Paper text:
SET domain methyltransferases deposit methyl marks on specific histone tail lysine residues and play a major role in epigenetic regulation of gene transcription. Methylation of H3K9 in humans relies mostly on members of the Suv39 family, namely EHMT1/GLP, EHMT2/G9a, SUV39H1, SUV39H2, SETDB1 and SETDB2, as well as then non-Suv39 enzymes PRDM2 and ASH1L. Here we report the high-resolution crystal structures of the methyltransferase domains of GLP, G9a, SUV39H2 and PRDM2, and propose a structural mechanism for substrate recognition.
The specificity of PRDM2 is unknown. Unlike I-SET, Post-SET is absent from the PRDM2 structure, which lacks co-crystallized SAM or SAH. The Post-SET domains of G9a, GLP, SUV39H2, but not PRDM2 include a ZnCys motif previously observed in the structures of Dim-5 and the H3K4 methyltransferase MLL1. (1) A flexible or even disordered state when no co-factor or peptide is bound. Mapping the electrostatic potential along the molecular surface of GLP, G9a, SUV39H2 and PRDM2 shows that the peptide-binding groove is consistently electronegative.
Residue numbers in the entry: 1 to 147
Write the structure that this text describes.
C-alpha cells in the first residue's frame, strides 16, 4: 500500500496466471500489472466499454465465513437451506479473470459495481471506460438525491 524503500515480500506476475484463465478473457479486456498495486496483476480496458456492460459470473470455492482468510478475492452469496456462503477465488485455479479486478480505494475511480443474477456475482460498468484505463470494483452506494 506504499511506494517506499521497505522490501516487498511477494510479487504476482503475468507468468503465474493459470493458462485457462488467460484464454477466457473477452476482447474488451487484458491482464497486466495493476497501477493501484503494481505487486499484483490487474485488468485493463483494450477498447471503449459502454456504461452498463456486464462481465461474469465471478466463480470460486463455496466455504463458510469461518474458513475464509481475506476479504479481497471473495464475495458472499446466500444459498437456500445451505446458508450464507463465501465464494472464494484466493486460489486462482478455482476462479476466472474477474478475480484479478482490483478494488477501488474508498470507491475512488470505481468503474464497476456488483449485481447478483442466478445466485452468482457479475460486475457491471458504472460509467464508460476508455482504452488504457484500469477496471476497479467497489460496493454499491446509496445514490438518491436529498433535494
Amino acid at each position: 500500500n506504499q511506494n517506499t524503500t521497505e522490501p516487498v515480500a511477494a510479487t504476482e506476475t503475468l507468468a503465474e496466471v493459470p493458462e485457462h484463465v488467460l484464454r477466457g478473457l473477452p476482447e474488451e479486456v487484458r491482464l497486466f500489472p495493476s497501477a493501484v498495486d503494481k505487486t499484483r496483476i490487474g485488468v485493463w480496458a483494450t477498447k471503449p466499454i459502454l456504461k452498463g456492460k456486464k462481465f461474469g459470473p465471478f466463480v470460486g470455492d463455496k466455504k463458510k465465513r469461518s474458513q475464509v482468510k481475506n476479504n479481497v478475492y471473495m464475495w458472499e452469496v446466500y444459498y437456500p437451506n445451505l446458508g450464507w456462503m463465501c465464494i472464494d477465488a484466493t486460489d486462482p485455479e478455482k476462479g476466472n479473470w474477474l478475480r484479478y479486478v482490483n478494488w477501488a480505494c474508498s470507491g475512488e475511480e470505481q468503474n464497476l459495481f456488483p449485481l447478483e443474477i442466478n445466485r452468482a456475482i457479475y460486475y457491471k460498468t458504472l460509467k464508460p471506460i476508455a482504452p488504457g484505463e484500469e477496471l476497479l470494483v467497489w460496493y454499491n452506494g446509496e445514490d438518491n438525491p436529498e433535494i
